[PDB]
Design a protein around this ligand. Structure first.
Ligand SMILES: COC(=O)/C=C(\C)[C@@]12O[C@]13c1cc(O)c4c(c1N[C@H]2C#C/C=C\C#C[C@H]3O)C(=O)c1ccccc1C4=O
Ligand SMILES: COC(=O)/C=C(\C)[C@@]12O[C@]13c1cc(O)c4c(c1N[C@H]2C#C/C=C\C#C[C@H]3O)C(=O)c1ccccc1C4=O
Lengths: 121, 121
C-alpha cells in the first residue's frame, strides 16, 4: 500500500486573483490559508474552515484556462441556506434540486468555473 | 456564515476510463469508491483510503480536455517510499526533491494529468 493520506490541494484556474480571493473568501465563506509569493507569482490558497483539502487560485497552467473548471462539488450541512446566502450576495444559483446523490445546487465563480453544493439526503 | 464543510470531490479529465481506473486504483493504490452509470456517462470515483475529498475520473467536460489537469498535490507520510513504489510499478517520477513546502515529487497519469506528492517537513 502507498503512504498517500489525502489530496493536500488542487488548482482552480482564475484570471483576476484579487477578485477570486474576494469571491472565495467573502462570498463563498472560505478561510484564507495563504497569500504570499510562490514560484510562478502570487500563491493564493483558500479552504473551508477545518478541511483537509484546499484550493489554489492560480493563473499559470496554459492547459487550464481561467474559468475552465467543472465538476467541483462542495459538501454542505445546509444547501438551502447556502443557496439563499449566495443569491443575496449576487450569485446566480441553479437549484437546489433533489437528486439520487443528495440535494444539490450549482453556481459559477467570476471566471466561469462551475461549483456544486451537495447536502446528503 | 456558510454551512460548507469541505470539498466532497473534484474532477480529473481522462479519455479511456478503464485505463484510468486501473492506473489510479492498481498503480497509485487509491480506493475505488464507485463505478456506475452517471448523468453524462460512466461515473468513476476514487480516493486515498479514508480521505474526505475524492476524485471523479470523467470525460464529460469539453472545457477540460483529457490530460489537461495540473497543480494537484497529494499528501503522503513517506514520499521516498511512494516514489520507489511508483518506479517499481513502471511509472516515471520526477524527484523527490526538497522544497520550501516539503519534500515533493511529480508523475503523470495515462492522459498526461500531472500529480504531485508532498511530505511536509
Ligand atoms: C512545475 O512542476 C509542477 O507541476 C509543480 C507543482 C504542481 C508544485 O511545485 C509547485 C508549487 C508552487 C508553490 O508556489 C507552492 C507549492 C507548490 N507545490 C506543487 C503545487 C501546486 C499547485 C499549484 C502549483 C504549483 C508549482 O509551481 C506548494 O506546494 C505550497 C504548499 C504550501 C504553501 C505554499 C506552497 C507554494 O507556494
Ligand atoms: C460543479 O459540478 C457540479 O455542479 C456537479 C453536480 C451538481 C453533480 O450532480 C452531478 C453528479 C452526477 C453523477 O452522475 C453522480 C454524482 C453527481 N454529483 C455532483 C457531481 C460531480 C462531478 C462531476 C459531475 C456532475 C453532475 O452531473 C454523484 O455525486 C454521485 C455520487 C455517488 C455515486 C454516483 C454519483 C453520480 O453518478
Amino acid at each position: 500500500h502507498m503512504a498517500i493520506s489525502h489530496v493536500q490541494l488542487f488548482s482552480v484556474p482564475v484570471s483576476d486573483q484579487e477578485k477570486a480571493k474576494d469571491f472565495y473568501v467573502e462570498t463563498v465563506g472560505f478561510d484564507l490559508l495563504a497569500d504570499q509569493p510562490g514560484v510562478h507569482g502570487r500563491w493564493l490558497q483558500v479552504a473551508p474552515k477545518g478541511a483537509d483539502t484546499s484550493l489554489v487560485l492560480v493563473d499559470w497552467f496554459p492547459t487550464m484556462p481561467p474559468g475552465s473548471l467543472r465538476g467541483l462539488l462542495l459538501r454542505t450541512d445546509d444547501v438551502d441556506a447556502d443557496c439563499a446566502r449566495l443569491q443575496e450576495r449576487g450569485v446566480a444559483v441553479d437549484g437546489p434540486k433533489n437528486t439520487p446523490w443528495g440535494r444539490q445546487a450549482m453556481f459559477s465563480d467570476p471566471d466561469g468555473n462551475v461549483i456544486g453544493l451537495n447536502q446528503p439526503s
